[PDB]
Structure formats: C-alpha cells, structure tokens
Nucleic acid binder design. Sequence first.
DNA 1: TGACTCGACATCGCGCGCTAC
DNA 2: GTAGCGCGCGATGTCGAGTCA
Lengths: 477, 57
Amino acid sequence: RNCSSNEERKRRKYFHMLYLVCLMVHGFIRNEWINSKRLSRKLSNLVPEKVFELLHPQKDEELPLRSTRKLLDGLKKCMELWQKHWKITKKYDNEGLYMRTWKEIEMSANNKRKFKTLKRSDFLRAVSKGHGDPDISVQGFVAMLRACNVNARLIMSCQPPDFTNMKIDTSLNAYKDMVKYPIFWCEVWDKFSKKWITVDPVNLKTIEQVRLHSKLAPKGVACCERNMLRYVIAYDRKYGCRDVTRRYAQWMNSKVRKRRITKDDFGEKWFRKVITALHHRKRTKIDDYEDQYFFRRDESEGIPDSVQDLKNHPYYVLEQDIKQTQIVKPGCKECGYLKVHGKVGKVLKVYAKRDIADLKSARQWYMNGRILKGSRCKKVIAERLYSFEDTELYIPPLASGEITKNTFGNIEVFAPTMIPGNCCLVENPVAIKAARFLGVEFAPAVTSFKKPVLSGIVVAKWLREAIETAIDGIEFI
Amino acid sequence: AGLTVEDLLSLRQVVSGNPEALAPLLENISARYPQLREHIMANPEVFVSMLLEAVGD
DNA sequence: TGACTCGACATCGCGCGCTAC
DNA sequence: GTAGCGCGCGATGTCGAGTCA
C-alpha cells in the first residue's frame, strides 16, 4: 500500500484550491496585460488590408456561411504570419505551467533559490520582439487579434496539482509527452454562425469549429500525466471570465467531474464565487448563445461506456448501485443499458437518478423536520420507510413565552423550520446558565446527537436581546 | 482575515509574472498565516479582489 | 458502536490499436 | 479493410481509513 492520512488528504484539497485561485487570477492579470494599448497599436500594422477585411467580413444575407469561410481564411492567414513574426520560441524551463506532482511541489517549497521577477514591461518587450515560450507566443497572438478589433478570448487550461491523487509516492514514467497539447490557446467569435471558433496558432497550428469533439483535448495515459483537463477558463476583451470546459470535455459529467473541486456542493459554490470574482462585465447576448451550446452539449453526452464512469455519476446509476434505502419511483423503468466491456454478452440496467427516490423512516424524517400524512411504507429493513412526497413540514406550536417542549423540557431542533415562528434559536454553551439567571421562559435546544445534545436555547424573540446581554456578561454571574 | 501589504504585493507580483515560482511562496505565507486557510474556504472572492486591487494607481 | 464509502494496488482476460499487407 | 499479434485498459476483489446514523 501507498496511502496518506486524512489530514494530508485535506491539505491537498486546500492547497489545490489555493493554487487554482492563483492560476486563474494570473489568467485574469495576463489578459489585462494583453489589452495594453501601446502594444496593440504596434501589432496591428502586422495585418495587411486584405486579411483585415477577411477578419471583418460583410454580412452575407443569402448565405451566412460564406462570411464564416472568409473569417476562417483570415484566421489561417493570421496563424501563418504569426509563425513568421515569432522569431524565437523558447522551451519551458523545468515544467512550465503543466501539472506538477505533490513530491515536485514539496521539493520546490524546500529549495528557495533565486527567481528573476518578470513584470509587465518585460512581457510587452518580449511579445514585440517575438521572444518567448509558446505561452507568451499564443498570448501575443491574441493581443494581435484584439488590436484588429476581433472578439478574441484567451483560453487557459488551469493545471493545479491533483487533489484526487491520494498516493504517498507520486512518481511518473518525458518532455515531448508534456508539450503535445497546449495550456494556452484562443477562441474567436463568429457572428454569422453564432459560435466560438477555437484557434491554436502555436502548438497544433489548427483552427477547429468544435462541435462534439476537439483536437485540443489531450489523449493517452502518458500525455495526461502532466495535462489533466479540468478547468478551461476563457477571458475576453471586456474582462469576462467564463468556465468553458464543456466545449473541450468529451465526458464532462463523468470523467472530468471526478477530478474537479466542483463534484460536491461546497466545491461548486466556492468555484462560482471565484468566477464571479473574475468576471467584471455584464451579460451579453453572446453569453446566452454560448450557454445554449453548453446546454445542448451537456444533454448529448449521455450514458458513459463503462462501469467506473457510472460510479457517483451526476445523472445516472446502475441498478446494482441503488442503495438499500432507495427504490424506483412508481411507473418508471430502466433508462438505458450498458454493455460491459470485457464480459461477453453481459448487460446492465441503467436508471436515471431522477427516477430514484430516497426513503427514510419516520424518525429520520422528523430529523429533517418533516412529518407524515396517513401514508404507506415503501420498504422495511424492521422499521417502515417512506418517500419524500408522503411527507410534510412540521410546524411546531408557537404570549409570556412558555414553549411546549418534548417530555424532557428541551426542544428538538434539527432544522430552521423547527423553531416556532415567534421564537428564536440562540446557540451557546452557557445559554442555559444565562436564561436560568435572568428567569424568562426559554427552552433548551437539542440540535443533534453525540446520546442527545443541548447546544443552546429556544426563547421567544422579544427576550432574545436580554440573553445576549447576560451571555455577554457571563463572567459576572 | 488579513495580511500585510509587503506579502500581498510580492504575491501579486509572482502571480502576475512568475507563477511557475508560486509554490514556495505559498508554502511560506500559508505557514505564516494559519487563518488564511479557512478564509480561502469561506471567502475566496475577498482574497481575489485583494490580489486585483494592488492597483490603487 | 456498526453499514456503508473512498482510492490504491493486485489480478486477469478481452479485444483494442499497432503494423503490414 | 484484414489477419496476425502483443499487451494496455477496464472490470473485479481486497485492504485500510473514514463517515453517517
């Protein structure tokens, strides 16, 4: 075995978040520097009138397609002349911005060495001279398109260290293998076909109109050691920041979701906080056209081709992975089959998760603040369990402020719903001490089990302020 | 939930022009600011904006 | 305190992805 | 496209720690 402590697990998740935030901010700032007005004006003169006109074609009403084609020819001519402008293409020192191993990090922490600061001037100078690694090159390419007034995003595949890598060794079996796919690239907006065109002028030297498959998404076990596609962030002229992974992920909901922080709900909410932090403009109609592409993409993925990809899948579950406490919602059935690779003829029943109901016993429901009505049990395990639609909120009874409580003179509060309407919950170890010293008419809160737990008090709201003062003065009792 | 301005500046500068070198700085600063950890979990957007407006310029 | 979970590593047989027509 | 072919990739099981009730 090769396994680390739950503490190291939790550190890896945090440091992953931290490193990701930094990466994505770097994207944000670099995209700023790309917009520099002094540089733009110099790079514009690189683009002949013929090509410029190709980059801004006239609306063609009878066949929009021909305008798209002219843009593609323009984009191809730009890629070519950029090949010529960029005179010196460096190698990444060490690993560049490709994904690193926990061991590699720990050791870079250790050795401090000497690091030449860059800043904004030095970047500009490099791009104008045409000296840099492929990241600089592509980034420059995007600057140039922008100086021609095309809607040109910078795309960045953020490669933070893997927080799903649990191993204590972390050791790999090549430079050529790392550089096979790019970290940075470009998108360009087609107003005629209402789609984003993908452009990689430096590494793959292609232009693709991604529909369901893209040449840029890395393939083969060896190449994915240093490039694990998780967060593809798009930055635009007007300082938008949009997560565009769905364009580039063939299996987004299966393969890729397991490797992103967004797989639990805390993760998603955190991630959205950062994107919004980085998205400094207001919603345009283009944003909507994109969301429509993503929606259709997100609904054409469908069932995966393997059992491992159906573990903890957002939408889907094999009949065999349905929990003892779940049942199939009346009058639903399998939604699909999975031929199991490497077993002859073996087929599995795939159900949609929306057709699966979670059942709980009466006590468990109460513990979610719900009561039952005359319903029927769905299954027994020996204690009857009921579906969510069998159930109903519990509204506990509401002058002086005596609260009708359980037999023990406490209140069972497993959910905000369960505070009476005219009362408030105050959680504090001594809240009972406070309340007892100044009298009143409170009631202890049982919020969970250890086996009860009185974590605080339930008192009428008019009396809350008093307790808060007494608590603040507890040292004086 | 807070940090000096000498560290916030150096960190903006690494993040902006030399992110390859992030690793040891973050190790350091995280070792000098325990509370930063839980901050980052609750309120990332603040730490972001802090890294964005070192441009009081 | 017990069912149920999560990732690594082992084992293993398929048929997948090469040339070389 | 096809046959000849070696082994890479995914299915199955266990092992330890952890999580929920």
